[model samples]
Target chain A: MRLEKFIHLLGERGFDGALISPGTNLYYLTGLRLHEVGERLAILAVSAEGDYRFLAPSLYENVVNNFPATFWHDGENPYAKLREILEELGISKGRILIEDTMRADWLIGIMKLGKFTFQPLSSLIKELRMIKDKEEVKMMEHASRIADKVFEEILTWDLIGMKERELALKIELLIRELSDGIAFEPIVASGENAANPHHEPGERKIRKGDIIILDYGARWKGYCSDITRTIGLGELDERLVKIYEVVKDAQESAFKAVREGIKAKDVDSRAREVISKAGYGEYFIHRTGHGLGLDVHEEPYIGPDGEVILKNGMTFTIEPGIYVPGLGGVRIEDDIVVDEGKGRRLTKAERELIIL
Target chain B: MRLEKFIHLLGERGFDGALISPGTNLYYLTGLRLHEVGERLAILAVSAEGDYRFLAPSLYENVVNNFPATFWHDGENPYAKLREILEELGISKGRILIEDTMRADWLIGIMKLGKFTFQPLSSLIKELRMIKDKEEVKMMEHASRIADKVFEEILTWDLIGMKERELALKIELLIRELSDGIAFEPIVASGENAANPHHEPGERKIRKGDIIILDYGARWKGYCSDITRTIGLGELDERLVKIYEVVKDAQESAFKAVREGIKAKDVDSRAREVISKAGYGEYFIHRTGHGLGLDVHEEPYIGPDGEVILKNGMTFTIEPGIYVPGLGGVRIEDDIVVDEGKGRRLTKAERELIIL
Candidate 1:
């Protein structure tokens, strides 16, 4: 497990201890899924000796007891308890690393209580969570399979006159039936609404010849799978069809560029080059894709400035899109992993343009 | 609108500028419901002179253009553009206030950019959001009615031998059909699983003489409604029935204590006293209630140390419970509003123990 190796980094990284807030990191270390609220402060403190403690309020006392935990009553100064624990561990001095999601005021409060130099642990956590292990990949693969099945089922229905919100709700219902829950809000944008990459599903109706973008993901276990596809209800406009073809080609080119020891930026450029060559560079907004796992978007983001080198077992997305104002948009996305030789597709959905 | 009065507080609060992230505050200021992501930075910077600027990435160029905005491309230093806007608005000096939900690292990044003193805008925002306007109150009332209707519909079905997760899913399906989405995960705890206040619905089946706690909420039009009802199935245990009565009385007593000019802590004392006098004080963990709105948990908390005084139009919850280990748990909750002279129960569900 990464916990012991992470604890050993305390000395190497010049930190006396580390504080992990209740999130993916906490779940990663201890098989516990917990969330923090403004009323409740849930924290996991790790000392140099590989010992750790989970701090939570009384409401979550039994839940926190699933791990080595310390419970405090409501209306108590939780920082005082944390300080006492640090004192017991002989970690009052030296630097203390905290996750980026820790509340700024709470982190500052803890710093003022003890002799510790607080620093962000974003990069450290990223380094560990970026590369998926075998079990994580297995979970993600299952999530991806269910998403594709849902896609196939959705396309078999009549979607020509469905409202975007109703279509999004149907996708949500299918996700719940097949998996845990939705990874994110399903983007059921159609017609001109598709031009906005992150448009919320609305009451806009799907008309004939309109391009519809279905961007959604299914969350299963603790892993998430994200996929996007553009569909034509009828014989779409000539420009829309051409845009869809370019986006598909760009997405495939990006997938081809993914391999061990290759820079993430190079993968992005391969896709950007395809769209730029098609003379619609400005229309292709957003990065190629992003890393996905326990959280939908995590680390080693595949963008122009992604300097991290791709490695075996590294999982991310290679999505390229062409969004035209007053027209519509076309995006092709899939989950991929850097295997022994090439990028292996986790989602086996057909990428060819589909005119429903 | 509270914008004019809020703008007047800039000088009073000693802040030359304020950064409002994408949240309820952003929606309250500009009638737009938006969310933030790592892919795009959405910030609303308001100057002391009442002028404002919206900073966002090109992906949201069209949405952000609804207000005065400066859009930047991906992989760009957005803080530099924000600084330039501040320079144009003559707000380079003096303190800057940010909301509590702003990511600590992002806030630290902006702190390192310019010569600006930083403070939290939580209290100021709470002062505005805690007191609901007529429209916000109406929306919350509608949300509560849907939650009650869902409960009424769920009880008519056969719940015996049904798994807790299956019941939770059935409730979730009903909520989506009647509302926008879930306010939070539905907690359908059966038998001993209900001992944990925040128990995740599990595979435990509802059996005879089991106490089932159905704690759930629904989100409608950005407002939230939270309600908890404990039901009995072919009950014969006298102690469980007694526990249920105490919890129901505790919730009603707490609701009776709600009124303008009363201390929130006093409202909590009203419930805690009843549970304590009944010899179940130790088992009565958690605060009595919390304010509800666009977010599930807001300010005006009814706890031991909650210092905020109750005010008119303040909507919150009055929930009290007694959880016993190895036995079971009983909780009665309802959403309430501090009206002109008395507390109004938004959720009109029956609180008496109903044997199913």
Candidate 2:
């Protein structure tokens, strides 16, 4: 998928050459995930002629039998060697797109050794990554299954006195047991902490009638799955129940609106209209959802004023949240893949307001 | 420490203003570590007159009470709001130092909005964070103690046929039980797998008479403690014993050479000289050490080409290793703080060869 397509992209973007460092983008192009190579830079350079080269420190080149290419020595001008490689490949000028997340220090060095207009290699990369193939969707489905299983197990445990931090750790451990690892840090916001949609799990204890929002995801292979469900502990307050209902309706509307050929903003508006009609427009903050894949956030985002057109094979979240300060909050999220002409949910966790 | 010092440093760097996004640099400027803001960018802008304001999505503005400032609405151009804030604060045009790790999307937007020359904010931020204060050293000391404790506990575990991946996960679970979390993924390599310095733990079963490398760290607060110790399982081969002894001596030589006002490369040479004299210079790849603090790899890096002068309160690792491709590798690492005039070892783990 990447061999010819990515090389074609370099020329399409009006670049004679491009460079990728050790990151997700690198992993996407080359099936190598280099890690913990302290101070040693692993770079993948691609010429417009569909030729790619892997460059790394001599140490890793000898030990790891992944990519075959050039090696550099310490105490010498390593970047100069990179410059030579570019020149030898007939890539001495024109516009060059470098990895966006490349360190500024490295970027400064590359700029000094090159005669070209430098730009970020993100939009092109996003265009390729936002769409999921069969294998990627399968991996995401597996990741979502683990998250659903963990949520079921979490409901069975005693949560009355457990701290939010403890629950978060336990969820992480369980995710580790079921999948590769956590997609991101688990958010076990209890009571008023739930008012903050992105609250960090702390030492706050859960009490009766508290609003517990469990926002977490599991990673399998390289794909990620995100799911959020707000639990009502004991008997919830009247305002809380109303808020929960509004959030659930909004999420469903957004999910329903998702399909091939629809604008991302259309889906976002479908979700926003529900919360607004419920008279809690301001409370329903943040975008409807965001694209998820190798990274938790990618492109084709379902957000306010999002203009990207939805397409088949695109995956994103359908989470609608409402935060009432001094009270509590509610958010219901799910991972959905655009299959055929409609949104197909990967996560199958129960979404109806659960009173524990 | 950051309020006036950062502003003064920005002016010194010939920048009229600066923008810091959510990252370690942002944590350095403001003590707030905002996470999971989902597409809602958290930015800190500072004017030339020392007036700084935090701009975040209105969602977090109410949830997090740490910062008091203006907020932006969804569906609006958030960067335009940021530009307005900069103008109202008497900051426009001229030169600006933006956080080096700012998203390329945000950087592009900022570039389009203003006529300011953008530069990386690393050198200025590194100068501030490189030196450790008393509390910072204390936290690092505490973090190292946990690593030492974990190493002791690991020696007692059965390793006749245990898989490297499972053992690594066990070590991670224990670290989380004691500290914040694992600094980075733990590397548990056995037998020939240890030949790769940055070997990823796999399901390879440990055999008798195999050399195992356990390289890991535990992050406490925001500080990191890294320690590496090679264990000779059962009766090790003669070549493995010789390699282990050489690495141990080289690390010790590097440790002894660390002192205030010394060039960081000089300390690296002390280790490299020993390894070279022992006729395994080529095998001892990678730098001698790197600075350790909020990030495992920070400023004042002790490496082959390091020019930074070591100072009191600077902390780093002094690890030197010899890798024999067909056999195994030995790396003995310890976290050292430049206290007083010499290197003070924070990790108190056993350094001598221990055959189990």
Candidate 3:
């Protein structure tokens, strides 16, 4: 059904066909989860007229699940096979939409095969992917529940004196056990290391009076859930505690601003205003949050310049942080979905600063 | 030093400049390990005259570590920033080399910026990356040692009755604790699941007489080490045992065939001959092996059509597998580096059929 809808959109957009690469887009369209084979051709070609063909390496024959495909051996020219598929689909000398993230080398290989103009397929696919259906929402909810449970369990553990990398590994193992896998590497930054938004876990040991930032997520059935919680190893600095409260308030304010028909940028502004009023405007770096679903970060980004309008079923994250140099940082993030004209929280983890 | 060598080669190849995407290539040229920020523009531009500049999102300013980069904010037109860098590099127009695996959308963005003919930068960089220097080889040797330790430790565990996925996760955790992280997901296929060379570990529990293929790798200081060993939980079938022996012989033969001045395809032939002589040639579903270094799989692939000439310092895998539909599979893999016109093994894991 999704394939049909996409083909219909192609006709409306005046594109002859579209080339879907192996990733979320391919999985969304064909119900086939193919790992990216570097430099090898594995793609789905769908024409506006409703014909589809899959070209993959012979190794994937068992994995494609009998989906009528033309297999090419490793030593064969996959580009030629793709050209054959295009000719069969009667898509010669026409504009074709290509997966935005398709490798440039792959695009070059395809270009040499035909006289066709290519455009990024994201514009055509984003609208469909942005609004999660009921099934997608359920998967995301399950994913969020897993993350919530992981956070609650991790809080019960004696995290003091543990290296950030060791704690991150423990969290990752828990996530893997509870769900499909981690959406990304667990970030377990403690003390001044938390000042860096995208810090990789290191050997810094957790100690009393230090603030730790646990930003991580889980994946379930291909959907993802991301959450962040700033916790204290023990009694913490008042300044850092205040920073935590500011981030929590900013995150909640941003959540409240998320409603149907509101501009995405407005939600970002709500959080930015709260942090600015708290006099930590410059400390609040990076975007408020990002869209979450099949891809951890997608369209309808919650950023200062996000122009997309919020709609029912659109899901994203409301994460706001204050990172001050030398002292530490605090970030409270939550997944949210626009439902019944208002924002609804999906990740139900404790936002208050938890001390161990 | 690598940047200078690359720029010098770019000038010889008539490329005005090269745009290196954020990945291994970027790290190879510049000591920056910036994560691929999806749609964000994080690239390094190197002009043939040896001048270079890195453009990244403002959020990565701390990570770039004062590498003389041009930082752009989230909502800004990053393509425009890239154009400015190109102009400043005095490469307003001409042929330019682009990272091979760069997103097509990014390439399209660059294409719209100016009049330039683009080519894949892999050809220009592959020769440089394929031949590992002393430092790179040292890191890979360390990575291989970690993987070898993990394999030995896993063999001591009570693997029977354990699900394939669980064993994989355990291996992954051990690898993470020992090294930077896993090079790729560990493959712990048991019983018939092992018949699929690229099978994903699942809920199938290990059982007596089952052949389990543990193919995994680790990363150390950005270099990767891959190894695969097929072990029997108990007494395997006679056919499967013979299959295992054939694969081991094939792997050893291929390893011995690896040497400077030899065609990569010859290595494949050496392995294929051993399997064919044992009447399991048709059972070998994939290539003999692949080159491995910074990437788990890179240039100088050992396959039937591989034409690249092996050179000293070139490292690769010698994995020859035999997969029988119902009886399961067997694969013996080892990392080999060309040294002094001969091949030396980096991974010292047991290649003989180990009956646990």
Candidate lDDT scores, in order, read 0.84, 0.85, 0.89
- Name the lDDT value of residue A104 in candidate 1: 57
Q: What lDDT is reached at residue A279 by model 2? A: 94
In order, what are the TM-scores of chain A for the candidates? 0.96, 0.96, 0.97
Residue B325 error for model 2, in Å?
3.1
List DockQ, one per candidate, in order. Answer: 0.47, 0.36, 0.72
What tens-digit string does per-residue lDDT give for candidate 3 at B1-356?
Answer: 88889989999888899888888888888889876476788889888988889999887888889798999986679999989999899886888898998999898778777887788988889989999998988999999999899989988999879999889988987898788889999999999999989789999999998989999999999999999989998898998988887888788889888888989999999999999998887889888889888889898789998999999999988898988888799888888888888999999998778899
* Tens digits of lDDT, candidate 2, A269-321: 99999999999999876888989998888887788768999999999999989
Rate residue B264 of model 2 by lDDT.
96
Best by lDDT: 3
Q: Name the runs in model 2 displaced over 4 angstroms.
A: A1-19, A29-32, A36-71, A75-78, A82-98, A113-122, A125-130, B10-18, B37-40, B46-51, B59-70, B85-98, B113-119, B238-246, B274-282
Which 10 consecutive positions of candidate 3 chain A have the poorest summed lDDT?
A33-42
Q: Pick the candidate with the highest DockQ.
A: 3
Please provide, for model 1 over B2-115, each residue's C-alpha lDDT reduced to its tens digit, 9 standing for 90 to 100.
Answer: 776677777677778788777777877786555546535567888889888888776666565567888887778887887787778777667777766666666655655576
Candidate rank order under TM-score: 3, 1, 2
Off by over 4 Å in 3: A66-68
